[PDB]
């Protein structure tokens, strides 16, 4: 009988059966990998888990759980659940509100989000798929908050960070 999980190779050149240490498994990538995690995380479970962790462990680990428990609470408490923390549908601000800054960034997103749709039905080569998700994930951050990770510049003319949604809400 086998001892480990694995694929089968019934070799008769040695009259032996080698089971390669290769059983199936599952895993995904990027914004997608957290989207999964968030959906399964059973707040309740971790809530109870933290409850124990919180009042039982020494100040070093209990304190960490405490700060962790509020978030959990908040979600469950108010209701509106955490899985939405992931962007899948970017809401477009109205056309009259912005007569330019934000548009250049909106175009970026639109483009890549679209160049991507096309790069999925035409032919899906991995290295490209990813390289594309990256840029995409980068763009989605731009319109929201530029600077947090590198800074977007209108091509040659002005090395000035395009005013993103965040920049439009804070500051002096």
């Amino acid at each position: 009988k086998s001892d480990v999980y694995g694929r089968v190779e019934v070799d008769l050149v040695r009259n032996v059966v080698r089971v390669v240490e290769s059983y199936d498994i599952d895993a995904r990538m990027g914004a997608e990998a957290i989207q999964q995690l968030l959906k399964e995380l059973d707040l309740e479970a971790l809530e109870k888990e933290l409850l124990e962790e919180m009042k039982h462990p020494s100040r070093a680990r209990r304190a960490k759980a405490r700060k962790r428990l509020e978030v959990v609470r908040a979600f469950l408490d108010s209701g509106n659940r955490p899985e939405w923390m992931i962007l899948e549908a970017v809401p477009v601000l109205p056309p009259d509100l912005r007569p330019s800054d934000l548009n250049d960034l909106y175009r970026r997103l639109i483009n890549r989000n679209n160049r991507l749709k096309k790069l999925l039905a035409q032919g899906a080569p991995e290295i490209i798929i990813r390289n594309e998700k990256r840029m995409l994930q980068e763009a989605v951050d731009a319109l929201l908050d530029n600077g947090r990770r590198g800074a977007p510049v209108t091509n040659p003319g002005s090395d000035r960070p395009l005013r993103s949604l965040t920049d439009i809400l804070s500051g002096k």
């Binding site: 809401p91 601000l93 509100l97 929201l144 949604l165 965040t166 809400l169």
Partner: protein
Amino acid sequence: KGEDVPEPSVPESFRVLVKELQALALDVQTLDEKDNPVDIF
């Protein structure tokens, strides 16, 4: 008209804020007496 000025509708600053907040994950929803929706528009 020699009349009495109308009553204030939601300052665009309020409106503009709801959206600026919609533009992001954050969802700013205005509510009524009994916690229910209310329309600026």
